[PDB]
């Protein structure tokens, strides 16, 4: 009744509120809302830390620019949030941590702009690398933090055997992992088609083979954003519009407290 | 059993 | 009954309900049936999805390994009097791709061993029938250094004693994972490099690799003492996942595998040429 | 401890419901054969993961 | 000693068999399951999910992001087909590698209705009417909208609802078709034409992409499990 | 009880009912019994038609194929290290004629494999017992190019692993037809030539042939690596139609078969010479 | 799940009704042996396919 | 392990036998029958049908 | 004389309580297989062999 | 059932009961559980000692 | 003679198996048990017993 | 028995 | 039988 719509939403977590007047409904990955570890599925015996509103809230990452040449962007979770306020502190002070996420991708333009972004949430997003060398991508390179990583139109093998770059080389039509992009739609996803919507909203459960795990050693979800259809505007052959990613941890809980983990990121 |  | 839904008789339509139009941006597949866009008759549908159940899809013995072992005079240079194999579904491509349509799995495993043998050289007399020992060595247990050292005593490790010519050997293994499900993919590391480390080798791990030995090895030997004449034997291992459950679907591997991880190297071009308006 | 079930009869002889008998000989459930009588489920978690799942005769976007 | 008589088949090994065998690790404390999100009970569930079609397999477009993009424009030759495709879900180069085509390549026989959904990725100010169609096998494959009109078709009107679905109803002689290419079990032709044309205003891009998706209706089923030609390993 | 009708006691007749006269033009066979034209006694008939039921008539294992495979050193010229056979009842004449007394059929099939082997040459030492792999390759699946290439991994195709000397291998197959019945005869084509075609090769088909591969092939190989000495082996396939149903009776083949279709070439003269009034 | 039927006894020993027992060990009906107890039918569809089937003591043509 | 004793006939193959054997294609979705006209239940039905005699087999 | 017990089911097929059947074929109990259903006991005779066993929240020495 | 004891939810303590202190001279092993010296949650324990029976 | 079909695994020997086998000394008068102190029912009981740690493994 |  |  009154005037409610699929397109107009308000999301509120902690002291953060998002409004959107042009959404295309919202996805709940695998039909599962985030929930806490139940006693009959519990494994670490120690009383957990549940930081609630201080960590379960909307952290906005650094904005990226979408242009005619952009091949795609990718992020890993929890890694993208490792430095985000009290969530980051809790993550590094505890051996174990589990958390679900609300993912909100933002990209507005105009009635005369054109293009379509595929937004995918992938469980265990294992990416391919640089070299002849198998499974060689270094920790610091596998983990870009907030910055994220990028996609490529083709595979350039890291040639310098003497001092190997040890990076990922994710080719766009192979979803950076040896499969075809068109089938990535079997993963929880939405599409931001500029004529249709400003944003994407995907709610993610904790997905893993275990009830809880090391957040520093292992990423649970990967967020891959690719231009399914390239950006275009009027005749201006150098158009550029912003894409902003905002993420909230949900039902976050931590186990195994001790001194802080300080990973070497250099 | 099924004796037929 | 497991038959699919019957097609309903559907007639003409002039209405404000538009099933044909939708918006894939939402993330959903449009649930349409033929009766939503064309006039359909009534069909009592008898077809069934029985052969595409997860169990049915994997219910087959797949070749995962060829272990070669020799029976001959123990000389003093690198021989094959015994052999070892890390248990994995990844030394072969066919089953690996089927299992990899899924992120996580749970199952019991059936191992079936086909053992063939032959004579190497033109002739040094013959050989009496051979008995093969296949010993499972779980991660941690003493590994064999010699074809007849104490490890083969197998007092706690499981061993199969196969007689050549007998029906192919078979065993069943439980769900033995350290987690609540087998991870076919692991976006992570077994170690984290820390700022306080001495060398940076200390915190270095292989990307996507979990434990070093993961499931252990099968050690194979011919229990028979050597004949004058040499006999080469091959043990073919067929594995079948039974009582299977799988989670989180994944896109099929589209380009050739490059080792245990998701890496690709060449033949990144799976798609043929075909003209846009050519049937 | 014999287990009895009905076979789904495909081609029928010129001769009704036909049965087969199963007995487990081993204590470990791993040793057991496959039942192959398996339950199917909704594609929904994959085909329609929406917060507000909408009905097909209505506009997807409203 | 019970008197027994060995029947044929004795001591054989069948890859497809279902039998009990000794447990090599007795009394093992199995790790219990936890409720993981995303469980699949049957391969057909994956085929019911829409995946994007590589519709454009032209020389410079194939195995590139552009293979997924069909170009529509306000100045296209309206007499021509936008696209022409054969209904061969496991074999046709455009369909064979979709999640549907891939699952179907692990089987020998398919049956049931398919549905094709097209997405207009143009600007909101762009309008247009398109005809998408399906011809059951047996006649000349449609070269003109005129011929295409006579078969199963949907006239798609571009607007707020971005996408349109055409159902290809199961119309066949045989109860099950082959996944391989074969004239005896052939499925027909899919074609697309402009019903009117793409119309844009000034200051608007006059050329844009259309994306396409395929998935199976709830009556779809497959049988006779086989190995796929889509993977292999060298010596 | 399945015994035939008892003969009835029948006496003399002087009447207007004439069972002896009829008119075959109607299309019907005159339903007469001996009591209709002669005086008969009462016979309590005990005979039965048990051995001529459709099941009984086909309940026998018939030789449909001899697949020859060799085990020897892989040289670089055309060898028989593996062999393939299109599954059909038509490479043999005996069962083909029995099934062809009917237009349509439905049945499950029992395949029984007899495997014999021998030594080719006077002597190069001997051979250890061989294991044979019989892989079924359904239409569409990758066919083997080499005796040990990846296709033999058989991860989804059914394979039998037969050990030489063991009781002859046996499997059962369901009713696998694309139609509701197997067509023993098809008065038609898989393609129609159309006026709008470019070459006229495009619409050309073999008369009476349905699908190109129809049921697929059995690929046979010796899994054993080669001995110095060569061993030739032959796999004899016996098929039995079980749980059979047949429709529309046909006249028996009267002249020798000329390939998969109804074609005849020579010995079109089945009937002997006999004088019209010679017993 | 044992199945019990009477044999049709041809030659009899100097010793009534004799039985045999059948048990299906496999889930797929294809795997089953043949019952061989089969029902017979009328030749009529072949021997008398007439619209107006006439009685044998009457004229075939009337 | 049940004590058994192999009787004569063991491991033989009889063309006329009637025994169960493993199904090579498990859980296969069989195409159901339709009522085709002209079903035969026994070979003698064919012998009850009148066919024309080659009475004249002269040179 | 068939013996029937419940298996502890670890990994479950997508198909409850499952059983297995045991029959002893030999007169000598030595010939029998192992039941493996075994009762556990208190470590106490080893971990607390005290004349006056004391409660853990109290002083061990009083 | 042969599963091990479930872990009990245990909270903070300020008391005269001292489970952490003992005297091994007695000959006894101190019977402590995690809840005796740290705050613990409730765990429904499913693990079993089936493979370590004699 | 009961018709049987030998399955894979036939005639193998598994170190981990649990099967009946003929008693080589039939009708033997077994010495009965007496209540010996110190019976163990499970290996974990031994792990619950405190043992002294070699904490100092210096040269 | 357990007839299902 | 003795079902335990
Ligand atoms: C990523 C690698 O592959 C897997 O994920 C994977 C592969 C195989 C699989 O099976 C478990 C492996 C360990 C089993 C395999 C073989 N085992 C035995 C035990 C006894 C004998 C005689 N022979 N084999 C017992 C332990 C479970 C998972
Ligand atoms: C006109 C040709 O002949 C027929 O009509 C005809 C002939 C044979 C017949 O059987 C079906 C043929 C396919 C079967 C044959 C053999 N199959 C298998 C399967 C697995 C193995 C190991 N070995 N064989 C499975 C599929 C059905 C019809
Ligand atoms: C339930 O199974 C009781 C009925 C048993 C009927 C006879 C079973 C014969 C096979 C027993 C196998 C014993 C394996 C140790
Ligand atoms: C119905 O069959 C119940 C009675 C069973 C009597 C014992 C059957 C022994 C053979 C069982 C074969 C099991 C095959 C898996
Ligand atoms: C109790 O066991 C009565 C039920 C018996 C069912 C049939 C058992 C078949 C196996 C008998 C083995 C005899 C060994 C001498």
């Amino acid at each position: 009744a009154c005037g409610y719509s699929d397109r107009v939403l308000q999301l509120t977590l902690g002291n953060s509120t998002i409004t959107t007047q042009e959404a295309a409904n919202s996805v709940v990955a695998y039909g599962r809302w985030p929930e806490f570890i139940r006693d009959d599925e519990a494994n670490p015996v120690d009383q957990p830390t549940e930081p609630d509103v201080a960590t379960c809230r909307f952290y906005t990452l650094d904005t990226v620019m979408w242009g005619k040449e952009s091949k795609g962007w990718w992020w890993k979770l929890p890694d993208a949030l490792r430095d985000m306020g009290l969530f980051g502190q809790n993550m590094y002070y505890h051996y174990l941590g589990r958390s679900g996420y609300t993912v909100h991708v933002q990209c507005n333009a105009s009635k005369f702009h054109q293009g379509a972004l595929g937004v995918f949430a992938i469980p265990e997003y294992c990416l391919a690398g640089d070299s002849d060398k198998q499974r060689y991508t270094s920790y610091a390179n596998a983990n870009p933090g907030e910055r994220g990583g990028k996609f490529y139109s083709q595979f350039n093998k890291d040639n310098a055997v003497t001092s190997p770059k040890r990076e990922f080389c994710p080719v766009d039509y192979l979803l950076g992992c040896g499969v075809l992009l068109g089938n990535a739609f079997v993963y929880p996803h939405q599409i931001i088609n500029l004529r249709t919507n400003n944003s994407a909203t995907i709610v993610l459960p904790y997905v893993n083979a275990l009830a809880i795990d090391s957040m520093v050693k292992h990423n649970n979800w990967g967020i891959a954003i690719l231009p399914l259809s390239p950006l275009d505007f009027a005749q201006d052959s150098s158009v550029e519009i912003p894409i902003t990613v905002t993420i909230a941890p949900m039902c976050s809980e931590f186990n195994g407290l001790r001194n802080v983990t300080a990973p070497k990121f250099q | 059993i099924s004796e037929v | 009954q497991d038959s699919l839904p019957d097609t309903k008789a559907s007639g003409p339509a002039h209405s404000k309900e538009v099933p044909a139009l939708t918006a894939v941006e939402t993330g959903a597949t449009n649930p349409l049936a033929p009766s939503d866009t064309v006039q359909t008759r009534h069909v009592v549908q008898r077809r069934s999805r029985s052969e595409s159940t997860i169990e049915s899809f994997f219910a087959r013995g797949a070749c995962v390994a060829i272990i070669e072992v020799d029976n001959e005079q123990p000389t003093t240079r690198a021989q094959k009097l015994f052999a070892m194999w890390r248990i994995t579904y990844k030394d072969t491509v066919q089953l690996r791709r089927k299992l990899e349509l899924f992120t996580y799995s749970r199952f019991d495993m059936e191992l079936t061993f086909v053992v063939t043998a032959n004579f190497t050289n033109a002739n040094n007399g013959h050989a009496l029938n051979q008995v093969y020992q296949i010993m499972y060595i779980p991660p941690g247990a003493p590994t064999p250094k010699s074809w007849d050292d104490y490890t083969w005593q197998t007092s706690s490790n499981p061993s199969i004693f196969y007689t050549y010519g007998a029906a192919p050997a078979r065993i069943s293994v439980p769900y033995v994972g350290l987690a609540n499900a087998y991870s076919h993919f692991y976006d992570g590391f077994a170690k984290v490099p820390l700022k306080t480390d001495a060398n940076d080798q200390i915190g270095d791990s292989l990307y996507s690799a979990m434990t070093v030995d993961d499931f252990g090895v099968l050690a194979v030997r011919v229990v028979n003492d050597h004949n004058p004449t040499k006999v080469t034997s091959k043990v073919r291992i067929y594995m079948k996942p039974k009582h299977v459950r799988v989670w989180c679907p994944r896109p099929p591997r589209a380009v050739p595998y490059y080792g245990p991880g998701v890496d690709y190297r060449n033949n990144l071009d799976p798609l043929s040429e075909k003209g846009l308006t050519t049937y | 401890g014999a287990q009895v079930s009905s076979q789904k009869v495909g081609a029928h002889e010129n001769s009704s419901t036909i049965n087969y008998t199963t007995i487990n000989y081993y204590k470990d459930s791993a040793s057991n054969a496959a039942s192959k009588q398996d339950y199917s489920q909704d594609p929904s978690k994959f085909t329609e993961p929406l917060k507000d799942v909408l009905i097909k005769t209505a506009p997807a976007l409203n | 000693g019970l008197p027994v008589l060995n029947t044929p088949g004795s001591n054989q090994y069948l890859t497809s068999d279902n039998h009990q065998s000794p447990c090599a690790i007795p009394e093992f404390d199995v790790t219990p399951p936890i409720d993981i999100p995303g469980e699949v009970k049957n391969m057909m569930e994956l085929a019911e999910i829409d995946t994007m079609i590589p519709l454009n397999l032209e020389s410079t477009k194939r195995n590139t992001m552009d293979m997924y993009r069909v170009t529509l424009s306000d100045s296209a030759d309206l007499s021509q087909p936008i696209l022409c495709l054969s209904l061969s879900p496991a074999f046709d180069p455009r369909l064979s590698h979709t999640m549907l085509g891939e699952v179907l390549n692990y089987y020998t026989h398919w049956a049931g209705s398919l549905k094709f959904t097209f997405l207009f990725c143009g600007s909101m100010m762009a309008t247009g009417k398109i005809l998408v169609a399906y011809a059951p096998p047996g006649a000349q494959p449609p070269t003109s909208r005129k011929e295409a009109m006579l078969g199963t078709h949907v006239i798609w009107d571009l607007g707020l609802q971005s996408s349109c679905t055409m159902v290809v109803p199961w119309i066949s002689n045989v109860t099950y078709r082959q996944t391989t290419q074969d004239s005896f079990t052939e499925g027909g032709y899919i074609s697309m034409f402009y019903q009117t044309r793409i119309v844009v205003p000034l200051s608007t891009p006059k050329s844009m992409s259309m994306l396409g998706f395929v998935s199976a209706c709830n009556d779809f089923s497959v049988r006779l499990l086989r190995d796929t030609t889509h993977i292999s390993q060298s010596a």
Side-chain angles (χ1 to χ4, degrees), chain A:
Chain A
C2 302
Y4 296 102
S5 151
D6 248 7
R7 316 181 124 214
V8 193
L9 314 177
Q10 189 177 313
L11 305 165
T12 303
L13 272 166
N15 56 337
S16 60
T17 289
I18 295 176
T19 63
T20 174
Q21 293 193 60
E22 289 173 78
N25 209 310
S26 57
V27 171
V28 184
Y30 298 130
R32 285 275 278 275
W33 208 267
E35 65 174 33
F36 286 98
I37 300 169
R38 316 194 301 269
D39 299 339
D40 78 316
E41 287 188 341
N43 185 222
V45 303
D46 64 311
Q47 177 53 61
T49 312
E50 292 181 10
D52 202 67
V53 286
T55 56
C56 297
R57 49 163 263 124
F58 286 118
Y59 302 106
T60 296
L61 329 186
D62 290 333
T63 303
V64 301
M65 291 294 160
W66 184 13
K68 304 245 198 197
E69 300 295 272
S70 303
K71 302 305 172 172
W73 307 261
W74 63 265
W75 288 271
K76 301 294 189 60
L77 295 172
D79 181 58
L81 303 180
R82 62 157 119 129
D83 301 314
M84 295 299 199
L86 285 171
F87 179 79
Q89 300 303 319
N90 276 286
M91 181 179 149
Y92 285 121
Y93 265 99
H94 298 94
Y95 164 41
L96 306 170
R98 70 128 63 164
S99 189
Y101 308 92
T102 295
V103 178
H104 193 65
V105 181
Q106 301 139 91
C107 187
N108 57 281
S110 79
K111 303 292 198 287
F112 301 80
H113 279 64
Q114 184 175 273
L117 299 169
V119 183
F120 309 87
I122 304 171
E124 306 291 347
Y125 197 25
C126 290
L127 293 180
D130 262 0
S131 297
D132 258 302
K133 289 267 189 181
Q134 305 158 166
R135 297 187 301 173
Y136 203 36
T137 305
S138 84
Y139 183 91
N141 289 323
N143 293 292
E146 171 192 29
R147 184 177 72 245
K150 235 161 280 192
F151 281 97
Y152 299 121
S153 275
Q154 66 202 11
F155 182 61
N156 331 80
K157 201 163 182 71
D158 167 40
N159 229 101
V161 188
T162 180
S163 286
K165 297 176 179 175
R166 295 186 72 187
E167 300 183 63
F168 286 139
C169 189
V171 179
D172 56 19
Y173 71 100
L174 295 174
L175 198 57
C177 59
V179 300
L180 293 175
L181 181 96
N183 296 330
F185 286 89
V186 300
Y187 292 127
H189 66 281
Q190 277 200 311
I191 293 168
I192 296 174
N193 186 6
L194 297 183
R195 69 177 265 130
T196 308
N197 56 320
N198 310 124
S199 67
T201 305
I202 310 175
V203 183
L204 305 178
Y206 182 76
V207 175
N208 191 3
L210 300 162
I212 188 160
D213 204 352
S214 177
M215 284 178 145
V216 181
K217 288 187 177 185
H218 173 212
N219 287 304
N220 305 297
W221 286 102
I223 298 305
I225 301 180
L226 296 106
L228 298 180
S229 178
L231 181 66
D232 216 323
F233 175 53
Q235 261 70 230
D236 305 34
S237 64
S238 62
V239 199
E240 212 170 65
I241 57 170
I243 304 175
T244 299
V245 177
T246 298
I247 307 167
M250 284 170 95
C251 303
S252 318
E253 77 188 273
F254 304 89
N255 285 92
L257 183 68
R258 36 61 178 160
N259 58 304
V260 80
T261 301
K264 192 192 172 189
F265 275 114
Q266 295 321 154

Side-chain angles (χ1 to χ4, degrees), chain E:
Chain E
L2 175 70
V4 299
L5 187 151
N6 302 267
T7 57
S10 273
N11 300 285
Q12 80 191 350
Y13 173 31
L14 179 64
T15 291
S16 309
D17 77 351
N18 190 11
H19 292 120
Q20 300 175 58
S21 53
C23 182
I25 306 174
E27 299 309 294
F28 183 89
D29 191 58
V30 177
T31 291
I34 54 174
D35 198 358
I36 304 172
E39 200 182 353
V40 185
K41 300 300 176 171
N42 183 295
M43 302 304 288
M44 290 320 289
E45 285 162 53
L46 315 190
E48 304 218 45
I49 306 167
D50 269 337
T51 46
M52 195 191 260
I53 314 177
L55 294 168
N56 194 9
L57 297 186
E58 300 279 25
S59 205
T60 44
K61 308 308 185 68
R62 61 170 185 93
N63 300 300
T64 237
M65 273 285 131
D66 288 289
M67 73 180 145
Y68 291 121
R69 304 160 183 142
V70 182
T71 303
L72 305 180
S73 96
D74 75 332
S75 57
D77 178 22
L78 307 181
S79 60
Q80 300 312 108
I82 297 174
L83 51 82
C84 292
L85 194 178
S86 283
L87 193 78
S88 292
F91 191 81
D92 183 278
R94 297 155 291 212
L95 298 181
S96 83
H97 283 284
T98 62
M99 186 51 106
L100 175 73
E102 284 292 1
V103 162
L104 254 65
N105 274 270
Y106 276 110
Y107 287 87
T108 313
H109 310 148
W110 73 273
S113 311
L114 293 170
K115 54 190 162 66
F116 288 74
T117 308
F118 301 99
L119 173 65
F120 185 69
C121 298
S123 62
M124 181 261 123
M125 290 286 152
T127 80
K129 294 186 190 301
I130 288 167
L131 185 145
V132 62
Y134 168 61
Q140 182 203 175
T143 53
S144 64
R145 192 183 73 192
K146 185 116 76 177
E147 301 177 304
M149 119 180 116
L150 304 176
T152 305
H153 62 286
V154 177
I155 296 170
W156 175 22
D157 186 35
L158 302 181
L160 307 181
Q161 312 303 314
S162 65
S163 328
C164 191
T165 303
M166 180 188 68
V167 183
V168 178
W170 178 252
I171 301 168
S172 176
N173 55 348
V174 294
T175 69
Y176 268 89
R177 287 181 170 128
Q178 287 177 130
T179 46
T180 27
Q181 192 45 248
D182 182 77
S183 306
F184 191 82
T185 60
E186 64 190 356
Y189 314 98
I190 289 167
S191 58
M192 197 184 274
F193 291 91
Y194 285 107
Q195 182 73 347
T196 55
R197 71 170 166 90
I198 301 302
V199 188
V200 297
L202 304 177
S203 306
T204 308
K206 14 176 68 213
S207 206
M208 64 295 285
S209 295
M210 180 183 68
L211 303 179
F213 300 85
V214 71
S215 53
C217 307
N218 68 181
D219 59 349
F220 213 94
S221 51
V222 293
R223 67 183 187 181
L224 219 173
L225 182 76
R226 67 168 168 91
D227 266 301
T228 188
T229 52
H230 294 207
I231 187 71
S232 61
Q233 72 189 96
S234 291

Side-chain angles (χ1 to χ4, degrees), chain C residues 16-263:
Chain C
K16 277 179 283 192
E17 303 179 314
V18 195
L21 295 185
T22 193
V24 299
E25 297 91 345
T26 62
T29 301
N30 197 9
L32 302 195
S35 56
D36 289 320
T37 59
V38 308
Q39 288 192 233
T40 53
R41 64 165 286 156
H42 182 39
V43 181
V44 176
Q45 184 52 266
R46 283 184 224 287
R47 270 149 39 215
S48 167
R49 288 175 180 190
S50 54
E51 207 171 350
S52 50
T53 74
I54 303 308
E55 197 67 34
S56 310
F57 182 74
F58 290 106
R60 213 117 318 175
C63 183
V64 297
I66 301 175
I67 305 175
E68 189 193 335
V69 66
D70 289 333
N71 189 228
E72 70 171 338
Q73 220 234 234
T75 81
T76 194
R77 60 232 232 206
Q79 284 172 275
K80 290 157 171 167
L81 296 185
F82 80 94
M84 297 168 132
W85 173 70
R86 282 277 246 267
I87 299 131
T88 180
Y89 56 72
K90 294 191 188 158
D91 291 342
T92 258
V93 295
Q94 279 190 153
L95 175 59
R96 184 185 179 176
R97 198 180 184 260
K98 289 174 77 191
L99 279 167
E100 279 177 14
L101 286 161
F102 305 105
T103 315
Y104 308 104
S105 65
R106 237 184 116 94
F107 54 82
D108 290 322
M109 196 179 66
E110 194 187 71
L111 290 195
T112 324
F113 311 79
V114 178
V115 183
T116 46
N118 70 290
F119 292 114
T120 305
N121 312 309
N123 224 171
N124 278 70
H126 309 319
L128 294 181
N129 207 62
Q130 294 178 343
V131 177
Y132 303 72
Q133 181 177 356
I134 305 166
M135 184 173 69
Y136 171 53
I137 304 165
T143 51
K145 307 305 189 199
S146 148
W147 86 279
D148 213 357
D149 73 343
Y150 83 99
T151 63
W152 298 103
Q153 269 172 40
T154 203
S155 68
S156 310
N157 293 359
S159 284
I160 288 162
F161 284 90
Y162 176 74
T163 301
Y164 196 79
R170 182 133 87 192
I171 53 143
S172 292
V173 173
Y175 174 67
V176 295
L178 303 180
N180 306 82
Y182 293 127
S183 307
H184 302 164
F185 298 81
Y186 175 68
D187 186 4
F189 299 84
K191 314 170 188 233
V192 179
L194 303 177
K195 291 169 68 184
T196 66
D197 293 351
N199 25 303
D200 45 28
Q201 317 170 112
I202 324 176
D204 203 15
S205 306
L206 292 177
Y207 175 69
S208 277
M210 292 177 270
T211 49
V212 178
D213 306 314
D214 256 305
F215 300 115
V217 302
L218 292 184
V220 187
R221 68 166 178 153
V222 173
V223 180
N224 299 61
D225 286 354
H226 77 85
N227 274 73
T229 173
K230 172 187 183 165
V231 173
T232 298
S233 308
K234 280 179 183 178
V235 182
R236 267 149 170 111
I237 306 177
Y238 296 80
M239 87 167 60
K240 185 178 79 179
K242 51 175 175 163
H243 322 122
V244 198
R245 291 180 70 198
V246 294
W247 299 263
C248 301
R250 295 182 86 86
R253 183 71 181 183
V255 298
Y257 287 115
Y258 190 57
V262 306
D263 309 302

